Ligand binder design. Sequence first.
Ligand SMILES: O=c1c(O)c(-c2ccc(O)cc2)oc2cc(O)cc(O)c12
Ligand SMILES: [Cl-]
Length: 275
Amino acid sequence: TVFRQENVDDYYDTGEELGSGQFAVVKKCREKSTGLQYAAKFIKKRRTKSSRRGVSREDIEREVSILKEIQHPNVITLHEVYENKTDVILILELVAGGELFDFLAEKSLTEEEATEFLKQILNGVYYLHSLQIAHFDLKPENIMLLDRNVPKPRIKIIDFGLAHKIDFGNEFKNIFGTPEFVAPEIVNYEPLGLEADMWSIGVITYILLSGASPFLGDTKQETLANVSAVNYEFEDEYFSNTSALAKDFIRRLLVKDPKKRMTIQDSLQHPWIKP
Ligand SMILES: O=c1c(O)c(-c2ccc(O)cc2)oc2cc(O)cc(O)c12
Ligand SMILES: [Cl-]
C-alpha cells in the first residue's frame, strides 16, 4: 500500500518531541486546516532489502493495517499516513499525559489504583483479542495517560510495531520484545498467540502492585532465563499487605504453558477484577 506523498510539513506543524526509540521518533504536531493536535511518528525506512537498519516495508504496512482497524477508548487511533524516501509518518491520536512507566516512577500503587489502570488495559486488550490482534509488546512504556493530574488517569495502549493478526491461532515468526515482559514462548521461539499478551499483563500487574519486576536479572540473558523457568516469587517485603486474590490473579497469568494461562475473558471474570 502506498501512502500520502505530499510533504507532511505542508499540512502539519511539529512541536515538542514526545520520545524516540531505535527506529522511530514521535513529535507533537498540529494540523493546519483544523488546529487539532496529534502525535507524528516518524518511522525510518529500510534503504536496501538486505539491510538491518530501518524498518522493512512489510513491517510498516502491518502496523498501519492493524492501526486502521482499531477504534476503542483504550487504544491509540490512527489519523493519517504520509511517506517520503526516508520515513513513513503516522499521524496518531495525541496522548499527552506521559508513559505509565514514568507515572509509576513517581509513586507502588494501592490495589484500587492498580485495578483502575488494569481494568482499562484489560478492556483495551479484550477489544484487540476480540479482533484476533496480539500486541506482543505490552509494558508500562507502551501505556500512555491522557491526563496524569487526575485521581484515576485514563489510558491508551500505544506502539503496535510488533502487533500481529492471529488468524490461525498462532504466528511462528521470531517476534521478540523487551526481555522483562516477554512470555516464555517468545523466549523459546515457539509459536505465539494472544496468550503472550496475557503473560505480559501478569508482569505489568506484579509491577503495579510492588514497584518491582518479577523476572529482572542483572543482564538480559538472566532475565530471559528467569522468564523461561518461571523464576519469580512474591517477596514479602513488597507483597505483605497485598491481598491473596491479587496474587492469585498474577499467578494464573504467569503460567508457562500458554494453554493453561488465563485468557483475556478469564481475566475479566476473575474475582479480583469482576464487579
Ligand atoms: O516515545 C514514544 C512515544 O512517546 C509515543 C507516543 C506518544 C504519544 C502518542 O500520542 C503516541 C505515541 O510512541 C512511541 C512509539 C515508538 O515506536 C517508540 C517511542 O519511543 C514512542
Ligand atoms: Cl505508537
